[PDB]
Design an enzyme around this catalytic site. Structure first.
Site: not given
Ligand SMILES: Nc1ncnc2c1ncn2[C@@H]1O[C@H](COP(=O)(O)OP(=O)(O)O)[C@@H](O)[C@H]1O
Ligand SMILES: [Mg+2]
Ligand SMILES: [Mg+2]
Ligand SMILES: FC(F)(F)c1cnc(N2CCCNCC2)c(Cl)c1
Length: 265
Positions: A17, A86, A130, A134-135, A148
């Site tokens: 988002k 990562y 949450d 995806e998280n 997240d």
């Molecule tokens: N440390 C990471 N390594 C690899 N991919 C990541 C990592 N952090 C986030 N992503 C990718 O980016 C997306 C969004 O990250 P996130 O931290 O959940 O953002 P938001 O708070 O906007 O949901 C994740 O769902 C994942 O696909």
């Molecule tokens: Mg967030």
């Molecule tokens: Mg997220």
């Protein structure tokens, strides 16, 4: 301390988002990491600065192998940058779209890794709130890592922020705006266990209004292929009454988990 200049940016890892996440390498050390980029304007229009600070506070201080590290942050008048561990094998979300359904061993191993990480969190009275595919990210050995912490808080709590997107993982008390505790993450654990085995979450529906109805009434059914032991665990976690949901220790010691998980407590 850190600034953009310190990093070579690489390929886009994913989008959220507010978040736009990039592979990056630190110039002096050649350390590979993930850079989460947030737009200050978007953060202010939504008024979620408190979430951003909570995310940085909580996640930088936690240390567990099934929890994603956060190393630091910086800003530059347009943006905020979170510096993350990562995760090389991507999201659980992606993996579920690849395979459609997980088998029982894959599912139980994920649930154990999850329950371990959540138990560590709950021991500090941190609730994530949450938990969804995806998280959940994957390390170089395929191990699950919670990420997240945008929505996390200390228990007990109310909700002062608007529920933005999907209702699919939230318990009845959260969507009805009532007070809540640790037990919210246990409900989400049940929702996840079901979606891992079946390929879709148990209260999924076409509209918001209807998803809401299915959750508050706890209306779910199992497909034939779900085994009795999986049914038992999931039915125990998806109780309308929070206090009736098991402790994490009972999840890790459940017979179906112990028989199928390939990792220990
Ligand atoms: N440390 C990471 N390594 C690899 N991919 C990541 C990592 N952090 C986030 N992503 C990718 O980016 C997306 C969004 O990250 P996130 O931290 O959940 O953002 P938001 O708070 O906007 O949901 C994740 O769902 C994942 O696909
Ligand atoms: Mg967030
Ligand atoms: Mg997220
Ligand atoms: F670029 C980063 F992300 F800020 C970063 C740079 N060097 C790091 N290391 C030195 C400190 C101890 N950990 C081992 C590698 C880390 Cl962990 C992160």
């Amino acid at each position: 301390q850190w600034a953009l200049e310190d990093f070579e940016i690489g390929r886009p890892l994913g989008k959220g988002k507010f978040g736009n996440v990039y592979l990056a390498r630190e110039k002096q050390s050649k350390f590979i990491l993930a850079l989460k980029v947030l737009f200050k304007a978007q953060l202010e229009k939504a008024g979620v600065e408190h979430q951003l600070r909570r995310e940085v506070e909580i996640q930088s201080h936690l240390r567990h192998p099934n929890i994603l590290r956060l190393y630091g942050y910086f800003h530059d008048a347009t943006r905020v940058y979170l510096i993350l561990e990562y995760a090389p094998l991507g999201t659980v979300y992606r993996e579920l779209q690849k395979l459609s359904k997980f088998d029982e061993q894959r599912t139980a191993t994920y649930i154990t890794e999850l329950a371990n990480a959540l138990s560590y969190c709950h021991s500090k009275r941190v609730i994530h709130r949450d938990i969804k595919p995806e998280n959940l990210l994957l390390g170089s050995a395929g191990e699950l890592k919670i990420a997240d912490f945008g929505w996390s808080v200390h228990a007990p709590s109310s909700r002062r922020t608007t529920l933005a997107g999907t209702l699919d993982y939230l318990p009845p008390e959260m969507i009805e705006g009532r007070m809540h505790d640790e037990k919210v993450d246990l409900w989400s654990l049940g929702v996840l266990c079901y979606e891992f085995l079946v390929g879709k979450p148990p209260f999924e529906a076409n509209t918001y209004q209807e998803t809401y109805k299915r959750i508050s009434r706890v209306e779910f059914t199992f497909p034939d292929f779900v085994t009795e032991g999986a049914r038992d665990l999931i039915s125990r976690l998806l109780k309308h009454n929070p206090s009736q949901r098991p402790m994490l220790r009972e999840v890790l010691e459940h017979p179906w988990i112990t028989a199928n998980s390939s990792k220990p407590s």
